[PDB]
Amino acid sequence: EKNEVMSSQLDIDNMAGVFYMLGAAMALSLITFISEHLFYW
């Protein structure tokens, strides 16, 4: 059968979910910053 002996690399797309998580965290950080700025007005 199809053997799983594959030296798989981690290409720019094989591991990209972490970057989407970082982008969502940056968006949430901007939202928290604008909320704090509105609260400080």
Added chain:
Amino acid sequence: LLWGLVFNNSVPVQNPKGTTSKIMVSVWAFFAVIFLASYTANLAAFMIQ
């Protein structure tokens, strides 16, 4: 301080003293060392099969 202690370190300022405080962070560090050497093992076992 506790968020840093689970992702191996950032730059915290710790308990003032007080044996319950230092002890309390020390046993949180012992659950951080096991949690992180268990995720790495589990990630190394999926990537393979």
Added chain:
Amino acid sequence: EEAPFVIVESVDPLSGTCMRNTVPCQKRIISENKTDEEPGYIKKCCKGFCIDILKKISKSVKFTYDLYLVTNGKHGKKINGTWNGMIGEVVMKRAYMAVGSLTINEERSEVVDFSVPFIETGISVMVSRSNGTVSPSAFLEPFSACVWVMMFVMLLIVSAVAVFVFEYFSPPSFTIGKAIWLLWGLVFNNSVPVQNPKGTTSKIMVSVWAFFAVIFLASYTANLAAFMIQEEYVDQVSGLSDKKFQRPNDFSPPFRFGTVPNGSTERNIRNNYAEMHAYMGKFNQRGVDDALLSLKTGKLDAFIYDAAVLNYMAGRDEGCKLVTIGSGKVFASTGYGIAIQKDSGWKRQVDLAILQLFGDGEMEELEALWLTGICHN
């Protein structure tokens, strides 16, 4: 059928006969006594390895046969100058031939002729499979001394660069021991250091030493995780010639090993080993099934029997909790043959036919059908 080479199934209940795989063997056993001439005639049908050999021999040699199974005997032991069993039936001019497990030796060859051995059989030990633990030297295995000595010399030259840093620009001195402790800590994930004062070459310099520490440590862990997995191998004993059997008392609480008394293996041992036979008699055991049960419960440490039966028993055992060190190190390796009549004319033809079977490669197929099991891997 006292050996796992020929078996006995009474008869297919579909047609009242047996299939085209076995051959009808007449179980002509005297049941009750000699009161009548009734041989207890119940036509069974035998099959297996010796049966297939016999059926191949008759087609390669033109003859017929009728299996007169057995009467008052198992293999034949000389008692009061009289032979019984297969040898007794052959020597009395009543059988003219015998097949199965004969374990050819000198006493049987004295009065009964023999063909060429078609299978090997000697004295093999059977022990449980010892679990394979990791080597005591494994932490210092996944990295050669070259890597360690360079890492050390790189640490030294980086300390030299740090003591050269003392002549930097305007921005507790930064001594050699402090930098060594800081770099020793940075490779074993952290201790408690005090770092470069400032000075972009100093902070940068420790920062790129930290980048070689992160790669060195995630590479040792990967290499340690790749050895621990693959390597696994161990052996309990080397055979009857090892010091474990020659010197039983010169160890931890001594081993226990015994065979089935009143047999061939016990006779040879007693003939060529006095202290071994004494120690075996000090730990005698029951039949092969009771011996396997004793090996399973951790009561016996090594079982002694013939190679073929032990291999067959270990091939079909539950799981693979049995081992047989055996293989090349078998003692008194005899063979099984077809006991032809003394001074007969069919001996040459039958041994030539056996050698011809051996030539083309059918006996390997017969072994792969009737002699291998689950633990063949």
Added chain:
Amino acid sequence: GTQERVQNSNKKEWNGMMGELLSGQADMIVAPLTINNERAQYIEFSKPFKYQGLTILVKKEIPRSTLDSFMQPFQSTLWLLVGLSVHVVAVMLYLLDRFSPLTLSSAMWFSWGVLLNSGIGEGAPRSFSARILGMVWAGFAMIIVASYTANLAAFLVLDRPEERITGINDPRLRNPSDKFIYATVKQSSVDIYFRRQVELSTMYRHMEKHNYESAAEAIQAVRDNKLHAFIWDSAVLEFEASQKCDLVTTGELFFRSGFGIGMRKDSPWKQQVSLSILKSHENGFMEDLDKTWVRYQECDSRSNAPATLTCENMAGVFMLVAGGIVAGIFLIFIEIAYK
């Protein structure tokens, strides 16, 4: 010895030992002579002196991890995308300072410190947004290091070189490649056994172009990487596979027939010699001879463990460090010059 057609005449005559035994030039054969069927026609082989089989013999190889670099389990795009990613995060942490709720050089030092696990740097962001940003960035320096180590230790685990030939049913043996030279000793029992088979004969056509003129020359050529597999008896291969520590038998014996003293079909010696050998196999005389000559081991246990990382494959990080010292000296001249 075997049967071969003569060059000029029509009748077929035996060769070597068989010919010298038949043609009244020898009364006995005291030598390892595997009992066969084509030889028992004219020879009366006694009971076998020792049992053995036919096994292959290949050379032992160095594990040779072949890592060749450290950024080996990352693909050059991922190593570059992460760097601009440190700075974007650093410049964002710096920009989250002018607005009301940290110093830009120090905020970019802190992103370098949190992802290289270094202890350098001082100060933490004070705004809640930058605090959450650093709180999730820590989570990403650790996903990059835990992911780089599981990928490095799942390519160091699956780095098995190959699977050597086992037995005779291996499909790579029944139909071998062109650059897989392997042969046997001309005029022997293995030759007749391969010439007798059906498909093994279709492979035996291929072996036949090169077969060594003797077992010793074949064992010598196997070490020199000129022969890839040698099929012979196993009493001689076990002695070759022990002394040299670079020869190991991979396959399992598939032709079980031992040697035997063979004299011509009519002689009185034929009867007493089979009893001497049967009687002397039982009283351990053959065991004494085997312990004296045949088996004294000097290399064994077949560790076959994976490769230990050597300084030839892990020199990239040392080059990176040496490189760090050299650029550090130019940076010290810039610091003096900038100061």
Added chain:
Amino acid sequence: AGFAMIIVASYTANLAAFLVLDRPEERITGINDPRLRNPSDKFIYATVKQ
């Protein structure tokens, strides 16, 4: 320090070499499986009669 790190790197390689070799079993394949030609007692398996 060198020994706190050998204990943690060794505890993680042992944990991730017992999590790698934790395969449950190997299911029956084809018909030449030795476990099918001679099955155990607690291995009930049958077909549709006639």
